[PDB]
Design an enzyme around this catalytic site. Sequence first.
Site, PDB file in Angstrom:
ATOM      1  N   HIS A  70       2.739  -0.677  -7.174  1.00  0.00           N
ATOM      2  CA  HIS A  70       2.119  -0.252  -8.429  1.00  0.00           C
ATOM      3  C   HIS A  70       2.015   1.288  -8.494  1.00  0.00           C
ATOM      4  O   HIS A  70       0.987   1.862  -8.109  1.00  0.00           O
ATOM      5  CB  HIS A  70       0.693  -0.781  -8.578  1.00  0.00           C
TER       6      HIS A  70
ATOM      7  N   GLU B  16      -1.246   1.951  -6.048  1.00  0.00           N
ATOM      8  CA  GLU B  16      -1.582   0.822  -5.208  1.00  0.00           C
ATOM      9  C   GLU B  16      -0.316   0.202  -4.626  1.00  0.00           C
ATOM     10  O   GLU B  16       0.661  -0.018  -5.335  1.00  0.00           O
ATOM     11  CB  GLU B  16      -2.360  -0.201  -6.028  1.00  0.00           C
TER      12      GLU B  16
ATOM     13  N   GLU C 272      -0.980 -10.125  -0.956  1.00  0.00           N
ATOM     14  CA  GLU C 272      -1.826 -10.856  -1.893  1.00  0.00           C
ATOM     15  C   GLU C 272      -1.502 -12.313  -1.604  1.00  0.00           C
ATOM     16  O   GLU C 272      -0.347 -12.736  -1.782  1.00  0.00           O
ATOM     17  CB  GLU C 272      -1.455 -10.516  -3.330  1.00  0.00           C
TER      18      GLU C 272
ATOM     19  N   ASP D  37       0.572  -3.108  -2.578  1.00  0.00           N
ATOM     20  CA  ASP D  37       0.060  -4.397  -2.113  1.00  0.00           C
ATOM     21  C   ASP D  37       0.958  -4.930  -1.015  1.00  0.00           C
ATOM     22  O   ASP D  37       2.097  -5.341  -1.259  1.00  0.00           O
ATOM     23  CB  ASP D  37      -0.037  -5.398  -3.260  1.00  0.00           C
TER      24      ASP D  37
END
Length: 442
Positions: free
Chosen positions: A230, A214, A219, A216
């Site tokens: 991640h 992942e 956020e 990001d």
Amino acid sequence: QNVGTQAAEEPLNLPISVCTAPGNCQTEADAVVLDSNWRWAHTTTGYTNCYTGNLWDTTLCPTPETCTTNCAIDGVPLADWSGTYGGSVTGNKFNLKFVTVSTNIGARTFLLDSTKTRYRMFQLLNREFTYDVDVSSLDCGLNGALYFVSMDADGGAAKYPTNKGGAKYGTGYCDAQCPHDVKWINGLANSKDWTPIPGDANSGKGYYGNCCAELDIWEANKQSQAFTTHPCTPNDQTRCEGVVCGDNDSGDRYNGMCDKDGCDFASYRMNDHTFYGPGSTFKLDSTKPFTVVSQFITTDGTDNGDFKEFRRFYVQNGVRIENSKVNFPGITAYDSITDEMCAATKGLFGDLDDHKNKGGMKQMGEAMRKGMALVMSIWDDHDVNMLWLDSNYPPTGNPSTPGVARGPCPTTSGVPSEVEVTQANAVVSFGNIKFGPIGSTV
């Protein structure tokens, strides 16, 4: 999942731009599909719900295999996008309403390619990804997120023949949290040992989780924002059970296949509290729209190099705004994600560097090289009330201890039952998406 026959699936058209040089872009006629969790699940040859509220029907779904045989997910027609799910498009802008009143709470969606049969896969190494965002109506406890995950382009259809819908029905979701709340995993209902989540009338957790890498990009709400890598070992979609999921509840957060914390650059947490916030004297004013630019730098400046750096800058009302910097005594003033930044900041914060354990920026890059699916979502947080993003985490921690304070929100904020009333009309907008070589999108 089988596909139901009650309603045609009609994704929302969303054009993006693919660019070769600054102001030289061409339209790519993509579309937005709703995640399969939000779909009506009913009997294959009828109208009877297989899932209602936060429970599977035990007669129809005594086992996952029987559930999968008996049940099907159905389409989202155009009228239902706004009326039921709070999704709409105007030109190149996509809007997601948090609560839509029969009452829908949050949404997760994916970008389809121009055929509308596969996710638009982005090979992000040595590229720049850019979009305009409005999070002015999102306050403490809410998150309007834009991110990439290592889903399969067909949602797993080729791997799992019981998955009849594929990307067309928003199937195959996985992320670095290895979530058990995904209703369909590896082509099967995740109905074994299904447990409702208390205080969440729509959601539960099944036996399996679904893991994958992942990235990001965003956020955020109007109070705090973060970008985070991640990696997982491996990066690709992996159904998990037991310790491999790295479940929080069994003390396994750091024992699983994915880096759950990720390596984050969050301006406020990095000790610049004046960079981003809801007002004109913050450097970046979250009460107004702005452009978010992300550059994925490799070791040799080519598509074949290892991922080495996630760079970030912003544009607001024509004003270029460089990223904030890490601001602690004796720590280098990093303004990007690198392996060194991750080691130094996690060292300071006393956070376990699971990012490094999972192969670091290089491993994150391998996911990005294979291609990742774009996710756009709006959600509240039934586990941790979004305190990790926008408050003190842990809530009992001293806010002067580096790493604890992530935003100005009170530690009592973000209770889903409260935010679902108080912020019912919150809407995140993502628009004017642009993708191309480094330096090409503004």
